Amino acid sequence: GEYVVAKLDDLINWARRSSLWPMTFGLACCAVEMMHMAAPRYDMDRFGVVFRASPRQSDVMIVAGTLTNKMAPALRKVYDQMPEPRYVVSMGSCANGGGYYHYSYSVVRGCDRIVPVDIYVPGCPPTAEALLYGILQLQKKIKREKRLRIWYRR
Amino acid sequence: MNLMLALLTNFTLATLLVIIAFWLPQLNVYSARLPFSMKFFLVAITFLLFDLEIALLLPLPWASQTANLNTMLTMALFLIILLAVSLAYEWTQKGLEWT
Amino acid sequence: MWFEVLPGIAVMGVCLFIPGMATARIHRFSNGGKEKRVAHYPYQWYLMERDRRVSGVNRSYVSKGLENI
Amino acid sequence: TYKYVNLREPSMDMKSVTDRAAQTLLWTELIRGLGMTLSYLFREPATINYPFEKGPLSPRFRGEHALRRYPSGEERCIACKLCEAVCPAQAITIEAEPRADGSRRTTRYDIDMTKCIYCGFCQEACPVDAIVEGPNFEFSTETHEELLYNKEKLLNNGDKWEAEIAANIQADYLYR
Amino acid sequence: ELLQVLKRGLQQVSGHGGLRGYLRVLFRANDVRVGTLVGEDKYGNKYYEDNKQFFGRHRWVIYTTEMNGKNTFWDVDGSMVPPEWHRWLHCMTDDPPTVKPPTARKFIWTNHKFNLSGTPQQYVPYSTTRKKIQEWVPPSTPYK
Amino acid sequence: MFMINILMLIIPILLAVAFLTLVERKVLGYMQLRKGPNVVGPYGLLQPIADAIKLFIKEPLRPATSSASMFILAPIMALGLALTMWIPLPMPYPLINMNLGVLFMLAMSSLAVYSILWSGWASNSKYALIGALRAVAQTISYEVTLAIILLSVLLMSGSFTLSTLITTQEQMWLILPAWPLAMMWFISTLAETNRAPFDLTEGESAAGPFALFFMAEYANIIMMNIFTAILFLGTSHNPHMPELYTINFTIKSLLLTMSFLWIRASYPRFRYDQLMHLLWKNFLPLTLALCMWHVSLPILTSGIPPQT
Amino acid sequence: NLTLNGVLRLVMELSGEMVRKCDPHIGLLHRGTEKLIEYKTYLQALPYFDRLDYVSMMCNEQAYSLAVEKLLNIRPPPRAQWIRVLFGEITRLLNHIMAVTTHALDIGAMTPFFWMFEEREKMFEFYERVSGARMHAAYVRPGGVHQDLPLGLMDDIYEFSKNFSLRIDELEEMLTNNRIWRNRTVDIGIVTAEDALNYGFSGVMLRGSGIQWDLRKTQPYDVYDQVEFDVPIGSRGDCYDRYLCRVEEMRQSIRIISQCLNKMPPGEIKVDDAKVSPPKRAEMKTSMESLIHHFKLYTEGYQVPPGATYTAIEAPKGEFGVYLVSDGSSRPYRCKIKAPGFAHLAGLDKMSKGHMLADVVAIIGTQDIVFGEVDR
Ligand SMILES: CCCCCCCCCCCCCCCCCC(=O)OC[C@H](COP(=O)(O)OCCN)OC(=O)CCCCCCCCCCCCCCCCC
Ligand SMILES: CCCCCCCCCCCCO[C@@H]1O[C@H](CO)[C@@H](O[C@H]2O[C@H](CO)[C@@H](O)[C@H](O)[C@H]2O)[C@H](O)[C@H]1O
Ligand SMILES: N=C(N)NC(=N)NCCc1ccc(I)c(Cl)c1
Ligand code: SF4
Ligand code: SF4
Ligand code: SF4
């Protein structure tokens, strides 16, 4: 029986990591490098990562740029409308911890004050390749998930 | 019977796919007036009236078999021209505008 | 390369070929190896019902020739 | 000097008027657009096969920081704090004292990698090539805390990457 | 020309050592090109080049199936490339470490490690300085 | 036996739709100097399976609807009608041989708009109901020319039986005498299916329900292009080798469907009022004039087709 | 009247299809850059300018560097000036590609974005090779540039430039004569010459309306007076003409880049004044004076004589300037950033009168708005 549960986890994990549909908050500079990840050289679509997805068909939110206090409530609302399972990738110093505006009166010091974060991509900005490395790292995180194995043991 | 079986299968399968879509183990333990233009209403009515004239034109492939071809062609062209006339009337009366 | 688009096109093409191929072969199976009779008008239906009676087995697609004269 | 982008008068000769009518009715310029996208269908794509293939970089690339050593193994950093002073983001925090052998060395060298803007000013300011931005760009983490580097982490980065870092410095130091 | 195109396709099956080896690289790397082997590192990664490919596709690595006790048959990672080959693979230099080896130092890691985030070997930050203020310790014996 | 036949039509349609999503992504990719899916299975061949499973285990997060009944009804109507459009298609033989198959498809396609309208009601959102009404207005408008164009073509064919279109085109494709109609027909099908450059529902603007609306819409895309092939690019039928018809007929449909992808990759989007003008002020005048012409043409050439 | 409600919040009043009022709500990317700059040395403040119009990085750097050099009363060496014009025009190509193809993608034409972003990727390589960063290079600095070009870079810029005009041609084939593209842009967002001036427009927002003005011609800086190029001028002041001006400006940028490559002179790359520009590392490690000056430039920074200057360049999006106030110390007292998009977006309501909702997307696109510079 546990053999069945192990293989269904593999199946659903494979499907979810193989069809990661992102919503990008293109907040600032870092949005440019995610555009270069979609561009032909890296072609995120070839991994199953569609270029643009609506928030309600999205699986991963990519916070790409500085999150201000004025924008923080809007970002939380979009996260709360994401169907589950949902993941958050924080990309760039600004989103990671405030970066170069960390000491500003108007900047949230890291988007993890507003939403939970699964992957932190460092850089100002991270290169398109560095972002792609972070996306592939999120895929490996999903591969490790054991939702049914843990469900069967409750 | 064949066609009813086809229709039943198509919509029964549609019903099944919709319900299984709505159901799955989630593994969890925890009347007024729209602010919408009168122009959009006029599109619907215009479609309706033209749709009624298309109904009158559908028999034309069969009507072309008649021996009264002179009458058939005159009435066929008459109906289309009047349909064109109503389009011309709407056009000139600013009825196909959106500004 | 562009010819890496073909495998997906081939699968979709095979999928769209089965309905036409299946219907044609199911018709032959069910009609004694012939095309399914088309009866769009009452005259064609009348002959099809007459064939059913003449067939002797209640199948309009079983044909009787001069052997039965 | 200037030029007009869109100041032209269409010819009204019947041959030209009919040319525009054919374009309107036969959609010729729309067909011409179809040819361009068709020609791309048969071009080789620009995509590379990451992570088996990598985008090209130069020796100047500014990646993950590391602290370096002299060939003997002694740390290059002498706790001068010029990197900390110039850092545009105040991402560097340093403390220092005399080492047991009396050497001038740091007891704290932290870089908040989520404050850092990866500008390279620290490695420009360093007088002994101690702090560098290395070539690594694939160090994303699962937690915020993992990006708060202390001296042990930065020294480990230097020992991990020195082979590449030294060769990159060798290729670019004559431009500095 | 179409016939010549097809034979090149078949030479990739043989260039990869037969049908099984052809399918292994197809499913591991999504690519069946055959290149010149430039070298191999101590972890089993193999490095290839084909200079007729456009810049960026002219160098690639086929990752080892095991590294530091981790099964990497399907789970490959860009951080698996050791620093000596990192420079060549990213075109920071022209010649590989087999032709211009890196300068040896005693303190340089002999064993490369890939990204360890999310494992029990992940880095955990902490303050590296000692306590600054020393508290007074009261005497052990009684005397009020 | 007939039950087997129904399933051998329904199931291949769903698989064809699933792999159309792969083909569209890869065709768009290469016209954009990239590859599109090529990791999930060889050449992306498992990408549609991954997407389908992922969508069906996603949280069916629907905010409260105005009416539960119409929330379920809208996608059932959409998918059910879409599968129903296929049963009269001669490929070369139809599942159901209808004497009025052409009129049957027109009737069934005119009901497809209800799924749009009911979605607007069930969204419980004023703004989603407005988008649904804008979509309905576009759809019914382009229904007008599709009906008239189809009528004009049938005047050279002689009946509403779909298989008679095969006989009509035994010597010659109908695209040759009717290329002006084929042009407007083809654009009308794009506007009818909300395809670029007419994809204004997306421009202006989950889980399984979303996947079902998507599947129905992509099944309509394939079916419209099959109907275009039958209507204008008639394949010759050899009664002793029906598979030869099916092969050639399928190729024409694939190329026509791929041209929808081609057109999406090539053009910007119409403004809403501009695609309304394209129909009411351009297509409809020509369609009316060409309908008059095609009523007169068989009579003045003594080329009236047989009634049977 | 139905009311609807980087990133932007648009509050609009609609009567049917027509926009009756358009009220942009910005500040969603306001990060108090100007206040932060007051706590930085002049060098420390330079990287902030990469992150304003973060599509035109070295043009923002040039504007700040020119302002500081003016207050310092120094000038960069000639080779630094030619490099700065060379990479200024490469940066204009980066911006115009982003402006035109995302303007196209926003209204459905998604394919040119992919073709031209492969070209952007190759230009990102030129930034990375001179500075080690693909975008925020921090390369252009007061006194000149940080480092000299690596050997073999100009040859590769020539190779890229030699083929680029064909890429522009492919873009024009997709858009210029397309009746759908023209329907979306012709007679959209018409702005009169006098309204454009009074509303504070600049750049292509002016030239699209026939105004003959370009700071590279009228008020030249660095070595722009030594290169030949034409200024494209519009005739209708609408989105389509501004689109044509931007496409033609890309062609003229290649024309300027060709001259920069051929006329690049030898010599040093930063001003030979170690009280402003740091000495070479080899000098820093041998000469006592050089080490002192390196130490002081990287801690206190150079002091700037007290004064104020408004300094402007012809950035890819329009006039970009700084009002920079020095109090005599090594930290600026006040730095006001004049972003061309600030005034342009302030005129969206005026431009969108009598248009439909879907045209507002086109008008925002023709203004070329990056909210890094609008919000600062
Ligand atoms: C002996 C005498 C015999 C008598 C009969 C003679 C008849 C022959 C003469 C008639 C020829 C008419 C051709 C009919 C086609 C429709 C023409 C048409 O409608 O074009 C006008 C329309 C709008 O054009 P526009 O620039 O906006 O200006 C007009 C309004 N001011 O333009 C458009 O429709 C643009 C469409 C936009 C969508 C573009 C996407 C499609 C592009 C690729 C299509 C490829 C063609 C497909 C072929 C069909 C495939 C089956
Ligand atoms: C096409 C046929 C495919 C057959 C595959 C059959 C596999 C059946 C196993 C399904 C496992 C689903 O796994 C589960 O999916 C639901 C989708 O909402 C997720 O979401 C669920 O849990 C989260 C919290 O964890 C809740 O907030 C949420 O309301 C709930 O929907 C779960 O986080 C995920 O653990
Ligand atoms: N629209 C595309 N071409 N794909 C895409 N980007 N999203 C849609 C992907 C999709 C949706 C439903 C199913 I069922 C499947 Cl198999 C795949
Ligand atoms: S992390 Fe760097 S590149 Fe990204 S938004 Fe912040 S300053 Fe810009
Ligand atoms: S790279 Fe720049 S921001 Fe980062 S630590 Fe060095 S000086 Fe500070
Ligand atoms: S790293 Fe260099 S600049 Fe920083 S304190 Fe050490 S020696 Fe000084």
PDB file of C-alpha atoms in Angstrom, chain D residues 44-61 69-73 95 97 107-110 135-143 145-153 155-164 167-168 171, chain E residues 28-31 33 53-63 76-93 102-103 105-110 112-119 122-130 132:
ATOM      1  CA  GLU D  44      17.455  27.882 -36.000  1.00  0.00           C
ATOM      2  CA  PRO D  45      16.232  29.028 -32.559  1.00  0.00           C
ATOM      3  CA  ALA D  46      18.509  31.022 -30.275  1.00  0.00           C
ATOM      4  CA  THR D  47      17.691  28.911 -27.204  1.00  0.00           C
ATOM      5  CA  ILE D  48      20.528  27.277 -25.269  1.00  0.00           C
ATOM      6  CA  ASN D  49      20.160  24.041 -23.302  1.00  0.00           C
ATOM      7  CA  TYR D  50      20.467  25.267 -19.731  1.00  0.00           C
ATOM      8  CA  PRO D  51      21.854  23.906 -17.345  1.00  0.00           C
ATOM      9  CA  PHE D  52      23.923  21.781 -19.732  1.00  0.00           C
ATOM     10  CA  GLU D  53      24.787  24.958 -21.657  1.00  0.00           C
ATOM     11  CA  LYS D  54      25.566  28.326 -20.097  1.00  0.00           C
ATOM     12  CA  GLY D  55      25.310  31.911 -21.228  1.00  0.00           C
ATOM     13  CA  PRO D  56      28.730  33.440 -21.865  1.00  0.00           C
ATOM     14  CA  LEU D  57      30.307  35.653 -19.221  1.00  0.00           C
ATOM     15  CA  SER D  58      33.457  37.737 -18.890  1.00  0.00           C
ATOM     16  CA  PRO D  59      36.191  37.734 -16.228  1.00  0.00           C
ATOM     17  CA  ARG D  60      34.713  40.981 -14.865  1.00  0.00           C
ATOM     18  CA  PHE D  61      31.424  39.316 -13.893  1.00  0.00           C
ATOM     19  CA  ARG D  69      44.059  34.378   1.042  1.00  0.00           C
ATOM     20  CA  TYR D  70      47.710  34.848   0.239  1.00  0.00           C
ATOM     21  CA  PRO D  71      49.490  31.795  -1.210  1.00  0.00           C
ATOM     22  CA  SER D  72      50.687  30.884   2.295  1.00  0.00           C
ATOM     23  CA  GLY D  73      47.088  30.689   3.533  1.00  0.00           C
ATOM     24  CA  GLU D  95      34.680  44.139  13.686  1.00  0.00           C
ATOM     25  CA  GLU D  97      41.032  43.279  17.012  1.00  0.00           C
ATOM     26  CA  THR D 107      36.588  39.056  14.123  1.00  0.00           C
ATOM     27  CA  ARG D 108      33.380  39.813  12.208  1.00  0.00           C
ATOM     28  CA  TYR D 109      32.958  40.162   8.452  1.00  0.00           C
ATOM     29  CA  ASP D 110      29.291  39.954   7.443  1.00  0.00           C
ATOM     30  CA  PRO D 135      31.941  34.099 -10.701  1.00  0.00           C
ATOM     31  CA  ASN D 136      29.177  32.109  -8.973  1.00  0.00           C
ATOM     32  CA  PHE D 137      25.607  33.182  -9.696  1.00  0.00           C
ATOM     33  CA  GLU D 138      23.811  29.936  -8.766  1.00  0.00           C
ATOM     34  CA  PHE D 139      23.379  30.269  -5.010  1.00  0.00           C
ATOM     35  CA  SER D 140      19.665  30.839  -4.521  1.00  0.00           C
ATOM     36  CA  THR D 141      18.387  29.557  -1.184  1.00  0.00           C
ATOM     37  CA  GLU D 142      15.194  28.355   0.455  1.00  0.00           C
ATOM     38  CA  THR D 143      15.376  30.719   3.445  1.00  0.00           C
ATOM     39  CA  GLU D 145      18.665  33.589   6.757  1.00  0.00           C
ATOM     40  CA  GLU D 146      20.901  31.567   4.420  1.00  0.00           C
ATOM     41  CA  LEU D 147      21.778  34.792   2.555  1.00  0.00           C
ATOM     42  CA  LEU D 148      23.204  36.546   5.649  1.00  0.00           C
ATOM     43  CA  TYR D 149      26.866  35.660   5.170  1.00  0.00           C
ATOM     44  CA  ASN D 150      29.359  35.739   8.030  1.00  0.00           C
ATOM     45  CA  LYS D 151      33.133  35.447   7.838  1.00  0.00           C
ATOM     46  CA  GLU D 152      33.190  31.640   7.961  1.00  0.00           C
ATOM     47  CA  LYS D 153      30.836  31.431   4.987  1.00  0.00           C
ATOM     48  CA  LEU D 155      36.165  32.329   3.768  1.00  0.00           C
ATOM     49  CA  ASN D 156      34.654  29.011   2.675  1.00  0.00           C
ATOM     50  CA  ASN D 157      33.544  30.678  -0.556  1.00  0.00           C
ATOM     51  CA  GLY D 158      37.111  31.847  -1.090  1.00  0.00           C
ATOM     52  CA  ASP D 159      38.516  28.370  -0.524  1.00  0.00           C
ATOM     53  CA  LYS D 160      35.794  26.863  -2.713  1.00  0.00           C
ATOM     54  CA  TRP D 161      36.228  29.249  -5.654  1.00  0.00           C
ATOM     55  CA  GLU D 162      39.822  30.511  -5.450  1.00  0.00           C
ATOM     56  CA  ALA D 163      40.957  28.428  -8.425  1.00  0.00           C
ATOM     57  CA  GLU D 164      38.547  30.282 -10.710  1.00  0.00           C
ATOM     58  CA  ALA D 167      42.422  33.137 -12.995  1.00  0.00           C
ATOM     59  CA  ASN D 168      39.750  35.800 -13.512  1.00  0.00           C
ATOM     60  CA  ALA D 171      42.905  38.120 -16.843  1.00  0.00           C
TER      61      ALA D 171
ATOM     62  CA  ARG E  28      18.712  13.110 -19.286  1.00  0.00           C
ATOM     63  CA  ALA E  29      19.658  16.194 -21.317  1.00  0.00           C
ATOM     64  CA  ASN E  30      16.897  16.633 -23.938  1.00  0.00           C
ATOM     65  CA  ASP E  31      19.677  16.805 -26.546  1.00  0.00           C
ATOM     66  CA  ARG E  33      24.067  16.181 -30.445  1.00  0.00           C
ATOM     67  CA  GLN E  53      27.395  25.443 -33.238  1.00  0.00           C
ATOM     68  CA  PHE E  54      26.459  29.051 -32.619  1.00  0.00           C
ATOM     69  CA  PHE E  55      28.070  30.843 -29.687  1.00  0.00           C
ATOM     70  CA  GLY E  56      26.479  29.565 -26.489  1.00  0.00           C
ATOM     71  CA  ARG E  57      25.744  26.063 -27.805  1.00  0.00           C
ATOM     72  CA  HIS E  58      29.373  25.323 -28.729  1.00  0.00           C
ATOM     73  CA  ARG E  59      30.212  24.046 -25.218  1.00  0.00           C
ATOM     74  CA  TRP E  60      28.179  21.835 -22.914  1.00  0.00           C
ATOM     75  CA  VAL E  61      28.506  19.492 -19.948  1.00  0.00           C
ATOM     76  CA  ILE E  62      26.861  16.117 -19.427  1.00  0.00           C
ATOM     77  CA  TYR E  63      26.494  15.931 -15.666  1.00  0.00           C
ATOM     78  CA  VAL E  76      21.214  17.726 -12.188  1.00  0.00           C
ATOM     79  CA  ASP E  77      22.249  21.176 -11.014  1.00  0.00           C
ATOM     80  CA  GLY E  78      24.299  24.004 -12.485  1.00  0.00           C
ATOM     81  CA  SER E  79      26.125  24.256  -9.158  1.00  0.00           C
ATOM     82  CA  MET E  80      27.614  20.795  -9.806  1.00  0.00           C
ATOM     83  CA  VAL E  81      30.271  22.237 -12.147  1.00  0.00           C
ATOM     84  CA  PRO E  82      33.582  22.615 -10.261  1.00  0.00           C
ATOM     85  CA  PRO E  83      35.271  26.034 -10.380  1.00  0.00           C
ATOM     86  CA  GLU E  84      38.074  24.973 -12.734  1.00  0.00           C
ATOM     87  CA  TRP E  85      35.542  23.960 -15.390  1.00  0.00           C
ATOM     88  CA  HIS E  86      33.127  26.758 -14.470  1.00  0.00           C
ATOM     89  CA  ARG E  87      35.438  29.263 -16.168  1.00  0.00           C
ATOM     90  CA  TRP E  88      35.615  27.255 -19.399  1.00  0.00           C
ATOM     91  CA  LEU E  89      31.926  26.349 -19.544  1.00  0.00           C
ATOM     92  CA  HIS E  90      30.824  29.985 -19.207  1.00  0.00           C
ATOM     93  CA  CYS E  91      33.333  31.121 -21.861  1.00  0.00           C
ATOM     94  CA  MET E  92      35.281  33.231 -19.383  1.00  0.00           C
ATOM     95  CA  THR E  93      38.363  31.645 -20.971  1.00  0.00           C
ATOM     96  CA  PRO E 102      44.538  26.122 -12.245  1.00  0.00           C
ATOM     97  CA  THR E 103      47.274  27.133  -9.841  1.00  0.00           C
ATOM     98  CA  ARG E 105      46.960  25.987  -3.345  1.00  0.00           C
ATOM     99  CA  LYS E 106      46.925  23.969  -0.148  1.00  0.00           C
ATOM    100  CA  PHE E 107      43.754  25.636   1.178  1.00  0.00           C
ATOM    101  CA  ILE E 108      41.673  25.233  -1.997  1.00  0.00           C
ATOM    102  CA  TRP E 109      38.861  22.714  -1.620  1.00  0.00           C
ATOM    103  CA  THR E 110      39.815  19.353  -3.070  1.00  0.00           C
ATOM    104  CA  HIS E 112      33.636  20.691  -4.775  1.00  0.00           C
ATOM    105  CA  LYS E 113      30.179  20.949  -3.237  1.00  0.00           C
ATOM    106  CA  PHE E 114      26.993  21.938  -5.024  1.00  0.00           C
ATOM    107  CA  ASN E 115      24.235  24.162  -3.638  1.00  0.00           C
ATOM    108  CA  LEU E 116      23.343  22.703  -0.238  1.00  0.00           C
ATOM    109  CA  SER E 117      20.268  24.821   0.509  1.00  0.00           C
ATOM    110  CA  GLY E 118      17.425  22.787   1.963  1.00  0.00           C
ATOM    111  CA  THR E 119      19.614  19.983   3.349  1.00  0.00           C
ATOM    112  CA  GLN E 122      22.820  24.215   4.689  1.00  0.00           C
ATOM    113  CA  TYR E 123      24.554  27.300   6.022  1.00  0.00           C
ATOM    114  CA  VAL E 124      23.063  28.769   9.203  1.00  0.00           C
ATOM    115  CA  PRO E 125      24.198  32.329  10.035  1.00  0.00           C
ATOM    116  CA  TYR E 126      25.498  33.313  13.449  1.00  0.00           C
ATOM    117  CA  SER E 127      27.508  36.040  15.142  1.00  0.00           C
ATOM    118  CA  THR E 128      31.244  35.348  15.013  1.00  0.00           C
ATOM    119  CA  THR E 129      32.215  37.739  17.826  1.00  0.00           C
ATOM    120  CA  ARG E 130      32.622  36.839  21.476  1.00  0.00           C
ATOM    121  CA  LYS E 132      31.379  41.905  24.972  1.00  0.00           C
TER     122      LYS E 132
END
